[PDB]
């Protein structure tokens, strides 16, 4: 492992210090369908004409990014994405910008969001949740080794590929930091107590989110929910957590330590680092090397009738992509 990480850091650093830029143009892609929409951007399925490949293109409106004060976060996302490489991270193929928008073309994962699959089936068995959770463990080990904090873990940001393995996406909040950071960001149900209490936090928040993820995958609902964010935040800091009857004794033990309101003893943030997680009873049967190599039998293989298929994705209102004849926020995004 230490051997693997060492070399991984070498490649990341070279890219991190000399980020690729303007590697394509909008007119080289064919717009196919909208796969998701947010407050400042959208993701569309596109077809690259030269190669005949299908990709997921994330389009961000520079003006809306500025209004929402996400300029630095957007620069963080692209600079980090063009520099990483791990089997469980969706690959960024190209990036560019024009007068109005920022563009990030990633590899398309036709399988769809874990979210959609999880909700339809209710809950995943423990071996099933363990298989996915293990992939997040190694992904976080990787990211963290590079001083990167993810901060956006949730079923909505995990895609399932043709081999049945997970592909993490949405690096909108990813940041390279040594020491503490303070930005209030994330998703209610997944926020660590440190974040809600606004008191400087570190990568420990990612491990906490893993705790929430495993619980939701195995229960069918998150450990902390309510119709109002305030109500949700009260439950998270309370230091109280209830576990379904079917949860194994080990799983409940793995979660007590992960969803530890005292981040100075929360698994992942201890002297043993991630090993307190990897060597835990609930993972006793996991062959970590097997997971990274993808030689483990997937619990479920999504289906598709062909490349370009989008049935594993919801339908979204198709809006037009406009590009003003005037540059909009040049300086703010010069390094993109």
């Amino acid at each position: 492992v230490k051997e693997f990480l060492a070399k991984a850091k070498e490649d990341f650093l070279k890219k991190w210090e000399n980020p690729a830029q303007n590697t394509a143009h909008l007119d080289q892609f064919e717009r196919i369908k909208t796969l998701g929409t947010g407050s400042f951007g959208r993701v569309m399925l596109v077809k690259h004409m030269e190669t005949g490949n299908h990709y997921a293109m994330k389009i961000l409106d520079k003006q809306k990014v500025v209004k929402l004060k996400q300029i630095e976060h957007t620069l963080n996302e692209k600079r980090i994405l063009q520099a990483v490489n791990f089997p469980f991270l969706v690959k960024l193929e190209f990036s560019f910008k024009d007068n109005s928008n920022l563009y990030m073309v990633m590899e398309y994962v036709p399988g769809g969001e874990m979210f959609s699959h999880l909700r339809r089936i209710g809950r995943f068995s423990e071996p099933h949740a363990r298989f996915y959770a293990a992939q997040i463990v190694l992904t976080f080990e990787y990211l963290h080794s590079l001083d990167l904090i993810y901060r956006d873990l949730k079923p909505e940001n995990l895609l399932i590929d043709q081999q049945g393995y997970i592909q993490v996406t949405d690096f909108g909040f990813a940041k390279r930091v040594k020491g503490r950071t303070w930005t209030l960001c994330g998703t209610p149900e997944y926020l660590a107590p440190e974040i809600i209490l606004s008191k400087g936090y570190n990568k420990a928040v990612d491990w906490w989110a893993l705790g929430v993820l495993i619980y939701e995958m195995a229960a069918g609902y998150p450990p902390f929910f309510a119709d109002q964010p305030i109500q949700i935040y009260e439950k998270i800091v309370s230091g109280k957590v209830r576990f379904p009857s079917h949860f194994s004794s080990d799983l409940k033990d793995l979660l007590r330590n992960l969803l530890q309101v005292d981040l100075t003893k929360r698994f992942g943030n201890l002297k043993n680092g991630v090993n307190d997680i990897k060597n835990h009873k609930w993972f006793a049967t996991t062959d970590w090397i097997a997971i990274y190599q993808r030689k483990v039998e997937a619990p479920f293989i999504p289906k598709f009738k062909g490349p370009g298929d989008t049935s594993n994705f919801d339908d979204y209102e198709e809006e037009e992509i406009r590009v003003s004849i005037n540059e909009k926020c040049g300086k703010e995004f010069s390094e993109f």
Binding site: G38, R119, E156, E189, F225, A226, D227
Partner: peptide, 20 residues
Amino acid sequence: TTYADFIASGRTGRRNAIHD
């Protein structure tokens, strides 16, 4: 059941991120 309360809540759809 907690499962029922969850499905009946307004938090079963895609959950948006926060910051502001």
